[PDB]
Design a protein around this nucleic acid. Structure first.
Ligand SMILES: [Mg+2]
Lengths: 99, 350, 136, 227, 224
RNA sequence: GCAGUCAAGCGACAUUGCUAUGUCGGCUCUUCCUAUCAUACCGAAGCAGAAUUCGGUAAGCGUUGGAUUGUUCACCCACUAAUAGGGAACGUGAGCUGGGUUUAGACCGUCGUGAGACAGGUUAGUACCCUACUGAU
RNA sequence: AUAACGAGAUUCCCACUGUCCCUAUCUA
RNA sequence: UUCAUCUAGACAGCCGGACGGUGGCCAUGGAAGUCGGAAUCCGCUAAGGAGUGUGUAACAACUCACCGGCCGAAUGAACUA
């Protein structure tokens, strides 16, 4: 805590003795990982990955420019009412307009 | 402190997470041959689940984030100077409006979807509801982006009680206040010579006469937000003010400037147990302070409530005197006997 | 085990299931307790949560001072009234099942406890033993 | 599909292409006749400010540099294809990174100036040892009371590349024992040269050298070689 | 004044009993609690790994002074034999058949004066007086029936729970003929008797005890 | 969604303002899927600790007791590591329950001259054959 | 044109109980 | 399939240069090629962008575009099925 300790601790003691090299190795491996993920990641995840990759290519291309029948009552045979403001009496109205 | 806030994701990430959670949890397979009631219930359940998932995330933000409105004169001023209180309130109101819109959409579409009569109609209604929610979330991009940063910053702020017994180290920068703070209390703070070593109000705890104490070092004052933060802390905190002054020539600004600044901030200090400490005594021998310039300290002495302390970094003497000065004000603002039952004395068995 | 327990809990017969009424044993003013749930019990199908001597339960006061009614607070059973296996080799049971009310920290609401207090409850709860004038 | 990807970036500068080389060839050909004396210098390693100071340290003259093969083409690499009388011999002596100073004041004056021109240079020398404690910006070559401790940001550079076993507790860079960096009178390795350059120890000195000269009226190569 | 802890319980008095000539500690857990007393007491006085009725609350089930020790009926013959073997002949051990087995809570006593629960029969009161050789009185601390749990006493002084009234404090100080102070232990805990154990030259309390509490304990007990 | 916005290809990505007329439900039972709630193992996150978010494989196990709906609608209390979503004729009437739906009697509201009907609310209601499985000659 | 009374319809309190926690045993 | 550099030297790799006005004008407490706004030129080059990024509170340093040499024969970009 106390206002950016992490940055102060890094300044006082630095990163791991094998942090930068591992980061560079991971950056190099990023291309292989991306290539593998395109063939892998089946199912719906593949669709999202492909869409994101295509969007990324779109960003590079953009930046290249650097410079009813109703039955009522206790019977199913009374198919009288219908369905599509002082609603009319239900016994009188034949067409019902839902609220 | 407000570390309890877990996180706030951006609009795109939040929408993606919510949609993935809704798709994975709720059922996904339905056929046109199923009864219309089954399809209607399925789509209504999907819409309700998506709405609830969107709402719950916003609730953690509104509830998790402490409302900057009049939390405390000390905390409120610091939060305003660090996050533009107007902007903070505007963002919170925008998030509340987005949550209300999402709730309205979820309530309306569920009411509308129950009238569906075909699979295509219900699917279209569900897609429209999901698109409404997605657009509402997307419009909340900048508020969420700003809230992520303010959450990351607030979660690491120092925690102090304004009414606790404390002393604030004040004065011009490059005097040595950082070294005094590091020595008086256990706190890791840079002691570099440039005049802006302290970026924030660093704090450190120490004990005196069994009473919990903690010293706070000002970032420096010479308005800039960094300078204004210390002023608001001084004006609102009940802590004693310890104005550190550098007598040596290791500061670009002259001695007269420090005294003039102390006089300028005198109205804020005067009612808060002011004490003046002279630093860098190890390489000046203030005896060199000839009468031609001794008037500078005499002007400071014009106020009976202050005195000059010669310290080199007397390190514990300054702390003891500051604690005594604080107690003098705080106390004002604030065993049985045996009879011995007899003439015969009984002694303990050791 | 909940907060305040200073050791493992012995396996003893289940005396008080959910809804069981147990008499009070402290001067807090309450006279009976209605058990609604048992802390630390692993709920399983068809199986009503049940407590035992030394267990901590959530209960609402049914009789006594009205100020304590309608509120649910943790309670510790001091008497079980159902035979349980003691490691000393005796099948002992208490005259009446009773419990005491305490906060999650284990502090006893009442300054003192009345009547016998089970060994398996006093030993596990230091505060109960300190506030209990009788053990076993 | 498996091919190396390019780390190219949208920089504000582009390659000059073959047009610049062809233009420089014609410029060299014209200068060969415009001026009287010609020289074939060696400037394998020189700081740009040194070259700029040279270009203005004497009166009206043209200092011409360029690709070695382009300069050979301008002069001609064969006797039959030589542009001027016996100009093939002059090209035959061009070995390293060569440059031509076209001027007509005096043959002796130019060589005397080359002999007397000396300036500080890096190691690309006397032995040096790092202090046994905190390493300063100059690596102990100046009093610690005047120098400043090294910036912690470059410690990874010291560890990964310079091979020095640096450690950071109280992150002002410190080492457990004095480290020998360079021996007496030896061609320093690339790592040692980089270490010396970082410390700013420019003990070495550079003096311009010329292999041969030429004159428009002599019709032959002035085989004078001085350093 | 020394800070220690049980396995994880800050109520030292519950799991231990300390006197001017002997100390008792629970056997459960590990020897970390046992070694804490050794650092201050060493081998000057015996320290016995003893249980009472199979419980670890021996500090509250038993009461006694340098002249005697009392145990309830639930104590097995093995525990009594171990206590007899592990203590000198100068320390009496007497089985008590009283109705209230909580001797540590019912009885609060020092080397000269003792307080007991009024419900205790006169026979057990006389037995306590004879074995411990101390004056025994029936008293409560401002209505706190369990004197042994809400009060701590020693030849140097005593400490009672904060709720004790001024009149009650004066009466108890006059009766016990030692200074008394009303205060909390273990960071505001009102059960002073069970929270800590104290003798004429050593006070042991839980880690939660705050610095003001430690200072008050030291001042009242005159440990420094 | 409406009405625009520029433009790699032949209009993708990005971009401008607002915005229930059905009966299914529950007790027991076995099995299966992962779109992983909990448990195992890991990566990224202002992970200083603690606590927490997301992401990758992984279905063995675990995924509850209760106020309360006949209910289709569906909300709360508490425990627990968590109390995740689904299928097997949205399994399970010669398994049970008929709970709700639906005969013959009867009560109240509307209409109908009338008999009657409901927009409606209430009441009471009739395996001993083959194979599979579990055991066993 | 509202008392008593009811194999009338529904709600609640004391006792109670294997409906249940969780089932087990016996007799023809 | 088409461009684009190629034995007067294509790419990988090695190392050296990557300059002065200028720490360009504003805001600054610091912001010097890099927290930012409008800009983005002059002098010399074989080349060097009022500097592509890393970066110490500024610097600095590292490093990208670009150029020089040694490495010695095709390489590099897009598109098509
Ligand atoms: Mg400083």
């Amino acid at each position: 805590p106390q206002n950016d300790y992490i940055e102060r601790h890094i300044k006082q003691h630095g990163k791991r003795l094998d942090h930068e090299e591992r980061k560079r190795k991971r950056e190099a491996r990023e291309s292989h990982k991306i290539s593998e993920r395109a063939q892998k990641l089946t199912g719906w995840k593949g669709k999202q990955f492909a869409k994101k990759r295509y969007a990324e290519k779109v960003s590079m291309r953009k930046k290249i420019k650097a410079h009813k029948v109703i039955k009522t009552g206790k019977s199913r045979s009374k198919s009288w009412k219908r369905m599509i403001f002082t609603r009319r009496p239900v016994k009188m109205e034949r067409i019902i307009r839902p609220s | 402190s407000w570390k309890d806030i877990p996180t706030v994701a951006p609009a795109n990430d939040l929408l993606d997470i919510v949609l993935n959670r809704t798709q994975r949890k709720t059922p996904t397979v339905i056929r046109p041959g199923f009864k219309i009631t089954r399809i209607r219930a399925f789509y209504m359940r999907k819409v309700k689940y998506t709405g609830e998932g969107f709402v719950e995330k916003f609730e953690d933000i509104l509830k998790g984030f402490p409302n900057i409105n009049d939390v405390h004169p000390f905390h409120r001023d610091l939060m305003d100077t660090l996050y533009e209180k107007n902007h903070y309130k505007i963002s919170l109101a925008a998030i509340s409006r987005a949550k209300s819109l999402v709730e309205q959409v979820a309530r309306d579409y569920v009411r509308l979807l129950k009238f569906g009569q075909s699979l295509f109609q219900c699917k279209q209604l569900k897609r429209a509801a999901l698109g409404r929610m997605a657009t509402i979330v997307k419009k909340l991009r900048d508020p969420l982006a700003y809230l992520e940063q303010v959450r990351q910053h607030i979660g690491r702020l120092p925690s102090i009680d304004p009414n606790t017994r404390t002393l604030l180290i004040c004065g011009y920068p490059n005097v040595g206040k950082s070294s005094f703070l590091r020595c008086i209390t256990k706190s890791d703070v840079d002691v570099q010579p440039y005049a802006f070593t302290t970026k924030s109000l660093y704090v450190g705890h120490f004990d005196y006469k069994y009473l919990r104490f903690q010293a706070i070092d000002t970032p420096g004052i010479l308005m800039n937000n960094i300078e204004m933060q210390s002023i608001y802390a001084i004006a609102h905190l009940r802590s004693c003010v310890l104005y550190f002054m550098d007598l040596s020539e290791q500061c670009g600004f002259t001695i007269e400037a420090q005294v003039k600044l102390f006089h300028s901030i005198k109205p804020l200090f005067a009612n808060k147990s002011v004490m003046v400490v002279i630093n860098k005594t190890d390489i000046i021998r203030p005896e060199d302070l000839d009468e031609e310039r001794a008037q500078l300290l005499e002007s400071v002495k014009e106020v009976p409530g202050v005195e000059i302390m010669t310290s080199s970094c007397n390190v514990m003497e300054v702390r003891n005197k500051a604690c005594e000065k604080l107690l003098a004000s705080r106390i004002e603002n604030k065993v049985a006997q045996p009879q011995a039952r007899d003439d015969v004395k009984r002694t303990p068995f050791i | 085990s909940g907060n305040g327990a200073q050791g493992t809990k012995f396996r003893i017969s289940l005396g008080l299931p959910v809804g069981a009424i147990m008499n009070c044993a402290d001067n807090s003013g309450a006279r009976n307790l209605y058990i609604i749930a048992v802390k630390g019990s692993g709920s399983r199908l068809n199986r009503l949560p049940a407590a035992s001597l030394g267990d901590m339960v959530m209960a609402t006061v049914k009789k006594g001072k009205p100020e304590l009614r309608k509120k649910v607070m943790p309670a510790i059973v001091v008497r079980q009234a159902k035979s349980w296996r003691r490691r000393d080799g005796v099948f002992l049971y208490f005259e009446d099942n009773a419990g005491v009310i305490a906060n999650p920290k284990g502090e006893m609401k009442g300054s003192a406890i009345t009547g016998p207090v089970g060994k398996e409850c006093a030993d596990l709860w230091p505060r109960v033993a300190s506030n209990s004038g009788v053990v076993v | 599909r498996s091919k190396r990807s390019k780390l190219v970036t949208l920089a504000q500068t582009d390659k000059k292409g073959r047009e610049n080389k062809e233009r420089i060839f014609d410029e060299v050909r014209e200068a060969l006749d415009t001026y009287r004396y010609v020289w074939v210098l060696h400037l394998d390693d020189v700081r740009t400010p040194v070259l700029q100071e040279i270009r203005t340290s004497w009166a009206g003259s043209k200092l011409i540099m360029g690709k070695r093969k382009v300069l050979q083409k301008a002069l001609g690499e064969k006797r039959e294809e030589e542009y001027k009388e016996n100009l093939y011999q002059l090209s035959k002596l061009c070995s390293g990174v060569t440059g031509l100073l076209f001027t007509d004041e005096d043959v002796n004056t130019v060589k005397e100036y080359f002999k007397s021109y000396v300036r500080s240079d890096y190691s690309r020398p006397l032995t040096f040892t790092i202090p046994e404690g905190i390493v300063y910006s100059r690596g102990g070559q100046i009093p610690a009371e005047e120098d400043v401790p090294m910036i912690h940001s470059l410690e990874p550079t010291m560890r990964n590349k310079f091979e020095i076993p640096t450690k950071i507790k109280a992150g002002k860079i410190t080492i457990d024992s004095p480290y020998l960096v360079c021996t007496e009178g030896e061609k320093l390795d690339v790592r040692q040269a980089l270490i010396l350059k970082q410390f700013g120890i420019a003990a070495s000195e550079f003096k311009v050298k010329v292999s041969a000269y030429y004159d428009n009226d002599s019709s032959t190569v002035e085989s004078t070689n001085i350093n | 004044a020394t800070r220690t802890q049980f396995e994880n319980s800050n109520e030292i008095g519950v799991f231990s009993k300390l006197t001017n000539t002997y100390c008792l500690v629970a056997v459960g857990g590990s020897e970390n609690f046992y070694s804490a007393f050794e650092a201050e007491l060493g081998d000057a006085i015996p320290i016995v790994h003893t249980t009472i009725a199979g419980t670890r609350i021996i500090g509250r089930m038993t009461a006694g002074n340098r002249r005697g020790l009392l145990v309830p009926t639930q104590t097995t013959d093995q525990e009594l034999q171990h206590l007899r073997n592990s203590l000198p002949d100068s320390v009496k051990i007497q089985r008590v058949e009283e109705r209230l087995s909580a001797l540590g809570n019912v009885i609060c006593c020092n080397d000269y004066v003792a307080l007991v629960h009024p419900d205790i029969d006169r026979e057990t009161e006389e037995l306590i007086s004879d074995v411990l050789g101390v004056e025994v009185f029936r008293q409560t601390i401002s209505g706190n029936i369990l004197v042994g749990s809400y009060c701590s006493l020693s030849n140097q002084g005593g400490l009672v729970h904060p709720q004790t009234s001024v009149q009650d404090q004066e009466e108890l100080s006059s009766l016990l003929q030692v200074p008394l102070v009303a205060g909390t232990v273990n960071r505001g805990s009102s059960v002073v008797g069970a929270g800590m154990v104290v003798n004429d030259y050593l006070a042991v309390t839980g880690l939660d005890t705050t610095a003001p509490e430690l200072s008050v304990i030291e001042s009242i007990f005159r440990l420094q």
